[PDB]
Amino acid sequence: EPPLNPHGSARAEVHL
Amino acid sequence: VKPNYALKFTLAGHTKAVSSVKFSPNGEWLASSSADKLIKIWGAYDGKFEKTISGHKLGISDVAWSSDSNLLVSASDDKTLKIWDVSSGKCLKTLKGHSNYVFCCNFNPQSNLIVSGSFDESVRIWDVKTGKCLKTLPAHSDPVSAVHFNRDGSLIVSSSYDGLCRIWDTASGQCLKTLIDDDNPPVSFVKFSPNGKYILAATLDNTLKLWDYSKGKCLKTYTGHKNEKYCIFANFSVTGGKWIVSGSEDNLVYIWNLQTKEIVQKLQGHTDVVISTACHPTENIIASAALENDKTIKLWKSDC
């Protein structure tokens, strides 16, 4: 199975 | 004058969020980077897919062109930058040193240097030929959101979640200025104006500001868009009317009159956050790119 949270890139994620 | 940007092409191919789009200085190409670990090259005028450049081990947050349009640098979650020869697809150098995600990158106008910003809170200056880190600046106290050289390469501007914009002497590594207004929301993007006189800064309170660098004062404020979460690129558009261009978290591209601060156009079509916009060096062309639930790049063209 693929990972639940495929690693993407920091810019595409929300930094708290 | 108001522009009349109209949708020309939609570029599909990335399989995850697009993170950054940039036009080559010679005007021939658009580079896109993505969370899918890839850089793609497309024709600037016809939107035609050219090639994929690959090698990073995790997603890419930024990409930048050398002045002769022959090299790219990319900043990755794999903690490295890579310098690429675009024609051969070869990774010329891997720039190692950062201890956390590399978020932003740019070549200097001479293109013998690269500046990078990282989640490790540092700004690094690298030699393009050797791939060696020349300087590590203790730039900020939170992740560095943007780094940009001014037009003669003598200054670097950096921004951070720490709420500051800082300006650095490229030669010495010395901080020459810290810019802060009447509050310190996270600064999510900065860049110098083409003539080097101003800095455009985005903050995560739905605001863009034009700063006079020398005076150290905010001259213009742009509002109306949504930006509280992501580090969205903004631009000076100078080929026709003088605009400010930015993406937005309401999925639109916003265009403002630089002097009057009025919204002059909103470009509709993307289905997720518009994380990146870029303006063509000679023609009135805007590229826009969106996040994971969209995955496309759009090219828009205007008469002015």
From Swiss-Prot, chain A:
It comes from the Eukaryota. A motif (WDR5 interaction motif (WIN)) lies at residues 8-13. The record marks R11 as: Important for WDR5-recognition and binding. It is found in: Nucleus. Changing H15Y: Increased interaction with WDR5. Changing S9A: Increased interaction with WDR5. Transmembrane segments: none annotated. This is MLL cleavage product C180. It comes from Homo sapiens (Human).
UniProtKB/Swiss-Prot annotation, chain B:
GO terms for biological process: gluconeogenesis; negative regulation of transcription by RNA polymerase II; positive regulation of DNA-templated transcription; positive regulation of gluconeogenesis; regulation of cell cycle; regulation of cell division; regulation of DNA-templated transcription; regulation of embryonic development. Its main location: nucleus. It is found in: Nucleus. GO terms for molecular function: histone binding; histone H3K4 methyltransferase activity; histone H3K4me1 reader activity; histone H3Q5ser reader activity. This is WD repeat-containing protein 5. PANTHER family: WD REPEAT-CONTAINING PROTEIN 5, WD40 REPEAT PROTEIN. PROSITE patterns: WD_REPEATS_1 (PS00678), WD_REPEATS_2 (PS50082), WD_REPEATS_REGION (PS50294). Contributes to histone modification. May position the N-terminus of histone H3 for efficient trimethylation at 'Lys-4'. As part of the MLL1/MLL complex it is involved in methylation and dimethylation at 'Lys-4' of histone H3. H3 'Lys-4' methylation represents a specific tag for epigenetic transcriptional activation. As part of the NSL complex it may be involved in acetylation of nucleosomal histone H4 on several lysine residues. May regulate osteoblasts differentiation. The gene is WDR5. Changing T178M: Found in a patient with childhood apraxia of speech; uncertain significance. Interacts with PAXBP1; the interaction is direct and links a WDR5-containing histone methyltransferase complex to PAX7 and PAX3. Interacts with HCFC1. Component of the ATAC complex, a complex with histone acetyltransferase activity on histones H3 and H4. Component of the SET1 complex, at least composed of the catalytic subunit (SETD1A or SETD1B), WDR5, WDR82, RBBP5, ASH2L/ASH2, CXXC1/CFP1, HCFC1 and DPY30. Core component of several methyltransferase-containing complexes including MLL1/MLL, MLL2/3 (also named ASCOM complex) and MLL4/WBP7. (Microbial infection) Interacts with herpes virus 8/HHV-8 protein LANA1; this interaction regulates the MLL1 histone methyltransferase activity on viral DNA. The keyword NAD does not apply.
